[PDB]
Amino acid sequence: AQNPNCNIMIFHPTKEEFNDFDKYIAYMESQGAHRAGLAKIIPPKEWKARETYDNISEILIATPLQQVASGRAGVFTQYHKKKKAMTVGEYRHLANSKKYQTPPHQNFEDLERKYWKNRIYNSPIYGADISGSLFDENTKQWNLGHLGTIQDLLEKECGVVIEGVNTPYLYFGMWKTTFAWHTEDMDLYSINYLHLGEPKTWYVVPPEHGQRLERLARELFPGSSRGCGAFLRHKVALISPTVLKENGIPFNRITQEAGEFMVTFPYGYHAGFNHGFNCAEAINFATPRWIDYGKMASQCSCGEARVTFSMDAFVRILQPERYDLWKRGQD
Numbered sequence: 001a002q003n004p005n006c007n008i009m010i011f012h013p014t015k016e017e018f019n020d021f022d023k024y025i026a027y028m029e030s031q032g033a034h035r036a037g038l039a040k041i042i043p044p045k046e047w048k049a050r051e052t053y054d055n056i057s058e059i060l061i062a063t064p065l066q067q068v069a070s071g072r073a074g075v076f077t078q079y080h081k082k083k084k085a086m087t088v089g090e091y092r093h094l095a096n097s098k099k100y101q102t103p104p105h106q107n108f109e110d111l112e113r114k115y116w117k118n119r120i121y122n123s124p125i126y127g128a129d130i131s132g133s134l135f136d137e138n139t140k141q142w143n144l145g146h147l148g149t150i151q152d153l154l155e156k157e158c159g160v161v162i163e164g165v166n167t168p169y170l171y172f173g174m175w176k177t178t179f180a181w182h183t184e185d186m187d188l189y190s191i192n193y194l195h196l197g198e199p200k201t202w203y204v205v206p207p208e209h210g211q212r213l214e215r216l217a218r219e220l221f222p223g224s225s226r227g228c229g230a231f232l233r234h235k236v237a238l239i240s241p242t243v244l245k246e247n248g249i250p251f252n253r254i255t256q257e258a259g260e261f262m263v264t265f266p267y268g269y270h271a272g273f274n275h276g277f278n279c280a281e282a283i284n285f286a287t288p289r290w291i292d293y294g295k296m297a298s299q300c301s302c303g304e305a306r307v308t309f310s311m312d313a314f315v316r317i318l319q320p321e322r323y324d325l326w327k328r329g330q331d
């Protein structure tokens with residue numbers, strides 16, 4: 001078995017290897033990459049997502065989210081308070097302000113320490129889930145706006161034609177902006193490209209050990225657990241590396257820098273934070289190996305997790321028994 005310790009692997013494809021996305025994902029899995037839940041892909045040096053980022057300031061963040069924390073430093077939840085719209089230029093200025101900017105630090109480890117120590121005492125503002133792309137249409141390789149669609153994958157593998165579309169989303173981050181512990185909708189893959197700015201630190205649990213994280217989360221967030229049998233789908237709970245170590249949960253961590261891709265694999269729980277002003281783009285995708293994960297994916301039926309139009313069809317076709325109750329949650 002390749003990669004038996006489930007380490008995060010880092011890949012450096014050549015420009016030739018960067019042509020066929022599906023084939024490279026399948027290559028990575030042949031080397032065991034999926035066992036970690038997360039992989040880093042450094043693009044060939046010849047490749048670029050677009051020519052410059054000089055003209056992005058007028059993108060609108062229609063609903064910036066203020067991430068308010070509750071709990072203790074290593075075990076907290078966050079709630080997203082909606083704020084008034086602002087441009088990316090306005091947001092970058094805010095991110096760079098004295099109130100929100102990254103503190104002085106020695107290296108990524110010292111900044112990680114400061115994040116876990118101090119995150120709860122601040123409420124950074126996140127521009128998340130903004131439909132759109134920053135890839136130039138002329139970028140032909142690993143262009144997250146030109147991937148094959150999950151609906152087309154399901155059709156190719158299973159023969160069923162379904163409605164729905166699959167488009168990317170932009171994320172504008174600042175210091176301390178946080179992504180809570182989650183897997184993807186329907187335990188899909190994700191791919192995330194850090195277009196610009198400061199790094200993003202990731203933590204991940206190997207898929208084969210995801211239930212260990214779930215069991216800890218039910219112990220640590222006991223009222224949330226009683227309220228919903230898949231409450232990590234709410235994307236609000238954080239647990240620090242120190243806490244994970246204290247409870248024997250297997251995990252790994254890695255820092256993504258501008259110009260790098262990360263891939264999350266089916267049922268790879270992940271969480272993380274941004275080091276400073278940055279912009280990422282991400283999208284879900286599928287492969288043949290995903291299908292069985294999609295069939296087994298948990299679902300939130302309490303009604304909090306409230307998810308896309310396109311997830312309907314996935315549930316309907318892959319989880320017909322759940323369909324009924326899950327759609328009661330979504331209506």
Ligand SMILES: O=C(O)CNC(=O)C(=O)O
Binds near residue numbers: 179190191270
């Ligand atoms: O970058 C973020 O805030 C969150 N991204 C992801 O969870 C991802 O790409 O799967």
Ligand SMILES: [Mg+2]
Binds near residue numbers: 055056057058059
């Ligand atoms: Mg603009």
Ligand code: NI
Binds near residue numbers: 182183184190264270
């Ligand atoms: Ni994710």
Ligand SMILES: [Zn+2]
Binds near residue numbers: 302
């Ligand atoms: Zn729920």
